Design an enzyme around this catalytic site. Structure first.
Site, PDB file in Angstrom:
ATOM      1  CG  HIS A  29      -2.064  -0.992   1.082  1.00  0.00           C
ATOM      2  ND1 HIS A  29      -2.126  -2.150   1.828  1.00  0.00           N
ATOM      3  CD2 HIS A  29      -3.143  -1.016   0.263  1.00  0.00           C
ATOM      4  CE1 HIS A  29      -3.191  -2.845   1.472  1.00  0.00           C
ATOM      5  NE2 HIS A  29      -3.827  -2.180   0.525  1.00  0.00           N
ATOM      6  CG  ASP A  40      -8.042  -1.151  -4.430  1.00  0.00           C
ATOM      7  OD1 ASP A  40      -6.792  -1.079  -4.345  1.00  0.00           O
ATOM      8  OD2 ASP A  40      -8.808  -0.918  -3.465  1.00  0.00           O
ATOM      9  CG  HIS A  89      -1.860  -0.130  -4.463  1.00  0.00           C
ATOM     10  ND1 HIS A  89      -2.478  -1.015  -5.319  1.00  0.00           N
ATOM     11  CD2 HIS A  89      -2.820   0.325  -3.627  1.00  0.00           C
ATOM     12  CE1 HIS A  89      -3.762  -1.086  -5.017  1.00  0.00           C
ATOM     13  NE2 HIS A  89      -3.995  -0.283  -3.995  1.00  0.00           N
ATOM     14  CG  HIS A 127      -7.589   3.568  -3.605  1.00  0.00           C
ATOM     15  ND1 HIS A 127      -6.697   3.642  -4.654  1.00  0.00           N
ATOM     16  CD2 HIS A 127      -7.433   2.343  -3.056  1.00  0.00           C
ATOM     17  CE1 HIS A 127      -6.034   2.501  -4.735  1.00  0.00           C
ATOM     18  NE2 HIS A 127      -6.463   1.697  -3.778  1.00  0.00           N
ATOM     19  CG  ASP A 128      -5.070   2.053  -0.586  1.00  0.00           C
ATOM     20  OD1 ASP A 128      -5.903   1.865   0.332  1.00  0.00           O
ATOM     21  OD2 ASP A 128      -4.883   1.212  -1.498  1.00  0.00           O
TER      22      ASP A 128
HETATM   23  C1  LIG Z   1      -3.855  -6.072  -0.820  1.00  0.00           C
HETATM   24  C2  LIG Z   1      -4.981  -6.887  -0.182  1.00  0.00           C
HETATM   25  C3  LIG Z   1      -5.749  -6.045   0.828  1.00  0.00           C
HETATM   26  C4  LIG Z   1      -5.932  -7.453  -1.238  1.00  0.00           C
HETATM   27  N1  LIG Z   1      -5.161  -8.150  -2.257  1.00  0.00           N
HETATM   28  C5  LIG Z   1      -4.883  -7.610  -3.484  1.00  0.00           C
HETATM   29  O1  LIG Z   1      -5.319  -6.497  -3.757  1.00  0.00           O
HETATM   30  N2  LIG Z   1      -4.117  -8.288  -4.433  1.00  0.00           N
HETATM   31  C6  LIG Z   1      -3.794  -7.639  -5.696  1.00  0.00           C
HETATM   32  C7  LIG Z   1      -3.633  -9.547  -4.172  1.00  0.00           C
HETATM   33  O2  LIG Z   1      -2.967 -10.149  -5.008  1.00  0.00           O
HETATM   34  C8  LIG Z   1      -3.913 -10.137  -2.948  1.00  0.00           C
HETATM   35  N3  LIG Z   1      -3.573 -11.362  -2.396  1.00  0.00           N
HETATM   36  C9  LIG Z   1      -4.113 -11.329  -1.202  1.00  0.00           C
HETATM   37  N4  LIG Z   1      -4.790 -10.165  -0.938  1.00  0.00           N
HETATM   38  C10 LIG Z   1      -4.661  -9.389  -2.064  1.00  0.00           C
HETATM   39 MG   LIG Z   2      -7.531   0.587   0.676  1.00  0.00          MG
HETATM   40 ZN   LIG Z   3      -5.749  -0.052  -2.877  1.00  0.00          ZN
END
Ligand SMILES: CC(C)Cn1c(=O)n(C)c(=O)c2nc[nH]c21
Ligand SMILES: [Mg+2]
Ligand SMILES: [Zn+2]
EC number: 3.1.4.35
Length: 311
Positions: free
Chosen positions: A79, A230, A83, A119-120
Site C-alpha cells: 500500500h 484496486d 499501488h 484511495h489509499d
Molecule cells: C492487498 C490486499 C488487501 C488485497 N489483495 C490484493 O489487492 N491483491 C492484488 C492480491 O494479489 C492479494 N492477495 C491477497 N490479498 C490481495
Molecule cells: Mg484501501
Molecule cells: Zn488499494
C-alpha cells in the site's frame, strides 16, 4: 528538495500515452522513476481531457500529483504510491482500451481518476493499527470503513491545500457532485463494502437488468469498477504478478512492526476464486473490451494453482 522536484516535473515534457504504455492493461511500473510515474499521471489527466475540460493549470496539477505521491509511505511494501499509481493507470486503461469512457460523464471520470490515485493515502500497512487506534477507541463501529474515511479525508485536505486545487475550475455545484462521487469511490475500496454490494451487481447481470442510465446502478458500477482497478495487480502478466504477490505477502506476513513463499500460491488462488473471478467476469459483460483483465486473472490462477500442487 521538494520544490526542486516540482521544478523538474513542471518543466519536463510529457510523452504521449502510446510512448508511456499507459493504455496497456499489462502495464508495469518497475522500470519507472517517481518522476516518470508523475509524467504518466499528467498524461492520464491530459488524455482524458480533464486538463482542458476543467481548465487545470499545469503547475497546480503537478504540485497536486506530488503532494499525493508524498502522502503515501514508501516503507509500506504494497500500500504505497506505486499501488495507487497502478490503480489509476488501470482506471485509465479501462476507460480507454476498455472503452468504459463513453459510458460515463466527465465529472465521473474526473472523480474516478482522483479517487484511484487517492484511495489509499497515508496507508500504514494492513498490520498497522495506528490510524484506527488514534481515533475515538470504540471508533471502529461508529464511523465504519474507518481506513477509507481516513483516505478520503487525506484526499480532501490535499485538494484544498494552497497551490494544489485542481478542482478550482469547477462551479460549486460541479464540485459538490465530484466530491460526492470521489468519496463514494474511495469508500467503495473497502472490500467489506464490495462483498456486501457485489451480489446485487451480479444479480442484475444474470437477469439482464443492468442499466447504467439509472443513478442507483451507475453508482453501483462505479464502486465495482474502483474495486476492479484496486485489485488489478492480480491480472498482470505472470512475471509481473509473481512480483506484486511478493509485495502483498511482505506487507501481510513480514510487515506490522518491521517458509513464507509456500503460503503465497494458495493465498493467491483463494483470493482469485473468492474475490476476483466474478468481478472481472461481471466487468467483461458490461464491456467486452475489459476481457484482458479477466483473461489475465485466469492465467494467473492457473499458474499459482500449478505451484500450489507443487511444480
Ligand atoms: C492487498 C490486499 C488487501 C488485497 N489483495 C490484493 O489487492 N491483491 C492484488 C492480491 O494479489 C492479494 N492477495 C491477497 N490479498 C490481495
Ligand atoms: Mg484501501
Ligand atoms: Zn488499494
Amino acid at each position: 528538495e521538494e520544490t526542486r522536484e516540482l521544478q523538474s516535473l513542471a518543466a519536463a515534457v510529457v510523452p504521449s500515452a502510446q510512448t508511456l504504455k499507459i493504455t496497456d492493461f499489462s502495464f508495469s511500473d518497475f522500470e519507472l522513476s517517481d518522476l516518470e510515474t508523475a509524467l504518466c499521471t499528467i498524461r492520464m489527466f491530459t488524455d482524458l481531457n480533464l486538463v482542458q475540460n476543467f481548465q487545470m493549470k499545469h503547475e497546480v496539477l503537478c504540485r497536486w500529483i506530488l503532494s499525493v505521491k508524498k502522502n503515501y509511505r514508501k516503507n509500506v511494501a504494497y500500500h504505497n504510491w506505486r499501488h495507487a499509481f497502478n490503480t489509476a493507470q488501470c482506471m485509465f486503461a479501462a476507460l480507454k482500451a476498455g472503452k468504459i469512457q463513453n459510458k460515463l460523464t466527465d465529472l465521473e471520470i474526473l472523480a474516478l481518476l482522483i479517487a484511484a490515485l487517492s484511495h489509499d493515502l497515508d496507508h500504514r500497512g494492513v498490520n498497522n493499527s495506528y490510524i484506527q487506534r488514534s481515533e475515538h477507541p470504540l471508533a471502529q463501529l461508529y464511523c465504519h470503513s474507518i481506513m477509507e474515511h481516513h483516505h478520503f479525508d487525506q484526499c480532501l485536505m490535499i485538494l484544498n491545500s494552497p497551490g494544489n486545487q485542481i478542482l478550482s475550475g469547477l462551479s460549486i455545484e460541479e464540485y459538490k457532485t465530484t466530491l460526492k462521487i470521489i468519496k463514494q469511490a474511495i469508500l467503495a475500496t473497502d472490500l467489506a463494502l464490495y462483498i456486501k454490494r457485489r451480489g446485487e451487481f451480479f444479480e442484475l447481470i444474470r437477469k439482464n437488468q443492468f442499466n447504467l442510465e439509472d443513478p442507483h446502478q451507475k453508482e453501483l458500477f462505479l464502486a465495482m469498477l474502483m474495486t476492479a482497478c484496486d485489485l488489478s495487480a492480480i491480472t498482470k502478466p505472470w512475471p509481473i504478478q509473481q512480483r506484486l504477490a511478493e509485495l502483498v505477502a511482505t506487507e501481510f506476513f513480514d510487515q506490522g512492526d518491521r517458509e513464507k513463499k509456500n503460503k503465497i500460491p494458495s493465498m493467491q488462488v483463494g483470493f482469485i476464486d473468492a474475490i476476483c473471478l466474478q468481478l472481472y467476469e461481471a466487468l467483461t459483460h458490461v464491456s467486452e473490451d475489459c476481457f484482458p483483465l479477466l483473461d489475465g486473472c485466469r492465467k494467473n490462477r492457473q499458474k499459482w494453482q500449478a505451484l500450489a500442487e507443487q511444480q
